[PDB]
Amino acid sequence: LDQILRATVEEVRAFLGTDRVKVYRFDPEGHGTVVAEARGGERLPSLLGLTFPAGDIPEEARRLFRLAQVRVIVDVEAQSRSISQPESWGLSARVPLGEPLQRPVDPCHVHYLKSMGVASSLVVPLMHHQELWGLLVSHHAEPRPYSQEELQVVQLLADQVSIAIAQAELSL
Ligand SMILES: *[C@@H](C)[C@H]1/C(=C/c2[nH]c(/C=C3N=C(/C=C4\NC(=O)C(CC)=C4C)C(C)=C\3CCC(=O)O)c(CCC(=O)O)c2C)NC(=O)[C@H]1C
């Protein structure tokens, strides 16, 4: 699995040429590990082999990853603002899909990325419909907005990858 993913992040990155693209596996406890990381160069430190703090993924958001497989952070310049204080939640039948087009992100995570030297982050999961094995995230040091064309690229590869991680798991 590791070898496959590592090969996936390196090759895919070459196509996106994005400052940094990595795969993030989710552990039932929340302790996920970087099993795939690509970088343009020694410009941005490598987070490979490092462990992220458990709980990095909130509650309302993580549930969306399982429901809509669609998340992205907008240019910090436009300064999207949000509050970690949501009103109730949707029902099983209802599937909330970013009511607004600006889907503002609370400041806590925005400045967090600023600390990472990132302005806009895109997320295109590499997993199943009702089950999340991991998450893919791309970093672009530009205030430019996200385009559907970007989705076209990962849509075909992500689906083939999400399948790879699923098929590879059977080995063990
Ligand atoms: C601050 C109190 C907390 C918080 C809230 C929060 N998180 C997001 C957005 C995202 N979080 C990430 C982070 C990652 N990038 C990575 O490199 C990795 C792998 C190690 C992760 C998991 C990203 C890219 C997202 C998804 C984009 C999105 O906006 O959904 C959100 C949005 C959810 C919402 O609207 O409430 C917020 C506001 N982040 C924390 O970790 C807490 C400390």
Q: Does residue 31's CB lie within 6 angstroms of at least one atom of ligand 1? A: no
Q: Does residue 61's CB lie within 6 angstroms of at least one atom of ligand 1? A: yes
Which burial class, exposed, middle or buried, applies to 57 when counting CB atoms under 10 A from its CB (0-12, 13-18, 19+)?
A: middle
64 Cα: distance to centroid of ligand 1 (angstroms): 12
Atom 19 in ligand 1: residue holding the nearest Cα: 24
Number of domains making up the chain: 1
172 Cα: distance to centroid of ligand 1 (angstroms): 31
Place of tokens 């910090």: 76
Distances (CA, A) of 144 to 1, 44, 58, 120, 124: 34, 20, 26, 8, 18
The parent domain of residue 46 ranges over 1-172
Amino acid at 18: T
What gap in Å lies between CA 114 and CA 120, rounded to an integer?
A: 9
C-alpha triplet 83, 113, 88: angle, nearest 5°: 25
Amino acid at 2: D
**Which helix H or strand E contains 20, and what residues bound it?**
strand 20-25
Kindly report the CATH number assigned to the domain that includes residue 153. 3.30.450.40
Q: Does residue 102's CB lie within 6 angstroms of at least one atom of ligand 1? A: no
108 Cα: distance to centroid of ligand 1 (angstroms): 9
DSSP state at residue 42: T
Atom 16 in ligand 1: residue holding the nearest Cα: 137
Technique that determined the structure: NMR
First-residue to last-residue Cα distance in the chain: 9
Between helix 148-171 and helix 2-16 the angle, nearest 10°, is 170
Amino acid at 93: A
